[PDB]
Write a protein that binds this ligand. Structure first.
Ligand SMILES: O=C(Nc1c[n+]([O-])cc2ccccc12)[C@@H]1CCOc2ccc(Cl)cc21
Ligand SMILES: O=C(Nc1c[n+]([O-])cc2ccccc12)[C@@H]1CCOc2ccc(Cl)cc21
Lengths: 304, 304
């Protein structure tokens, strides 16, 4: 019982974090096998960030200009290449702590853990979601660039995010591990505004199912709805449209609780229209949308 | 920028988790040096839990009746003793991954990370606080007993909690690493009710300071108050009384923001009296109390 915003155990990713310095810029790198991945803006000064031409700035950099430090020991850089917005620094030593891993590009609404680091050292771990506007709401300070987002399936770490920047609104933007930004963001110090941060409907529904499993049932109404009727209300409240794929994905939670997905949609529709009235659901006064149906199942079943 | 409920990196504690089985009961153990710490109810059957006499049940147990497995390898148990509500199983092998550590008994209002485990395997990490009624609001299922709570100061892990039980209300109870329960709870399957779960005032104030640092300033009022006037309102709202020690502890946040502690108390007093009016502070529709002043400073400064 109880329901928490839970992050994956971070040990497997802590064993991959290194410090990358190029000139006077220091950030974090991810060391997997004999390659260190890091944001390509490690080659930029603060002035360069205003309008960087990365291919040009990279011409002035050699292997020896990238200082990679794992713990308090220096790694020898024997190659470097730019792939989209990340640099891959080939080192002469394979990371002995390299876990089984994959690089995945997640979809909006998917959650992941972030191991926030400074100077290649982990400071904390938190859970977040890729927002429908492709930003994330993280917690990152100067030096946190290169911190990664990941999910773990038993012993395989799927890295899905690498932190690159903060927008003027305090929201965050980054890339997958192939260097492609999520959303339309670019690694330049220029005004970039985020789109509408809509609520991940399927995630709210999953968390209402978690609430029912953990005993918070006050919001269960006597109504049902259809996907079309629900979606009319959802659009009005800046909630993402719910599809039959989302209903399918919620099937295991529907079965566990005996509450049909569309009945839970009707309860959510009434919560949107009536508000919480000062009440809480799982200790929250707002509808939480950063638990996927998979996270709810995993947390409520005990997957390790 | 951004402010998250952040847990400590869990790697150092993941390297200590083992599975402890006694007969047909399996839970988690913490392996530090050549000792495995676990809840003493590992010796009980479900029937025994109703009214256990631990000293008597322990007479029927020998070293070979405690099965300790670290990963998929069995540890040899060469001694066992009960200290309060924990069993200490002396093993013949010192844990090679033993980090620098301390056992601390925390005070109500103090936060810590929990590495939730099942069968000695980590499933997730979350942050919580020792409530003023000495319960915690965790996320624990069958088999999670023996999961620990901890804080990290650079490279030293201070273990402060070991999970033992869930109360009928879905809140959690456990001990420090010397086996002493927090609060008045006993390791028996008997009706035990929690006291008032008051709000940790000093923590709410710290989180309002974090909100100001991260740009959420709408709630800043034009008022000030005194500790006595504030505390009259705080008692009425089931908030813990604020002391001059709490004001001292908030001094660094007051200095960072230029907002005097008593002015922030007046803003909190108005939030209590007026409510949020549908607004949010750091993405929350309620006043968060599970960030200590130290956590706010650490997260806003980047301590690794
Ligand atoms: O965004 C950047 N830094 C930081 C990132 N984050 O997330 C938080 C921070 C806080 C406090 C100072 C720095 C921070 C750098 C700094 C300059 O502007 C850009 C523009 C594009 C790119 Cl890809 C990175 C950057
Ligand atoms: O509390 C216990 N289990 C579990 C603990 N927690 O936190 C969640 C759980 C969920 C689902 C089944 C079990 C769970 C056991 C089970 C029996 O009653 C007691 C009474 C006292 C003591 Cl010290 C431990 C226990």
């Amino acid at each position: 019982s109880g329901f928490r915003k839970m992050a994956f155990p971070s040990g497997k990713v802590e064993g991959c974090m290194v410090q990358v310095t190029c000139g006077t810029t220091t950030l974090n790198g991810l060391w997997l096998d004999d390659v260190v991945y890091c944001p390509r803006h490690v080659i930029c000064t603060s002035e360069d960030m205003l309008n960087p031409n990365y291919e040009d700035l990279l011409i002035r950099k050699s292997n020896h200009n990238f200082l990679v430090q794992a713990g308090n020991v220096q790694l020898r850089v024997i190659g470097h290449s730019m792939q989209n917005c990340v640099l891959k620094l080939k080192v002469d030593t394979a990371n002995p702590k390299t876990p089984k891993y994959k690089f995945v590009r997640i979809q909006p609404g998917q959650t992941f853990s972030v191991l926030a680091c400074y100077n290649g050292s982990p400071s904390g771990v938190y859970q977040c979601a890729m927002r429908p506007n492709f930003t994330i709401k993280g917690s990152f300070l100067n030096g946190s660039c290169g911190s990664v987002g990941f999910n773990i399936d038993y012993d395989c770490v799927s890295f899905c995010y690498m932190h690159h920047m903060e927008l003027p609104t305090g929201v965050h933007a980054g890339t997958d591990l192939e260097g492609n930004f999520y959303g339309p963001f670019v690694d330049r110090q220029t005004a970039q505004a985020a789109g509408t941060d809509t609520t991940i409907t399927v995630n709210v529904l999953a968390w209402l199912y978690a609430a029912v499993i953990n005993g918070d049932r006050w919001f269960l109404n006597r109504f049902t709805t259809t996907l079309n009727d629900f979606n009319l209300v959802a659009m009005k409240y800046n909630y993402e449209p719910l599809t039959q794929d989302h209903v399918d994905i919620l099937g295991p939670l529907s079965a566990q609780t005996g509450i049909a997905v569309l009945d839970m949609c009707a309860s959510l529709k009434e919560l949107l229209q009536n508000g919480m009235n000062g009440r809480t659901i799982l200790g929250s006064a707002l509808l939480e949308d950063e638990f996927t149906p998979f996270d709810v199942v995993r947390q409520c079943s005990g997957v390790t």
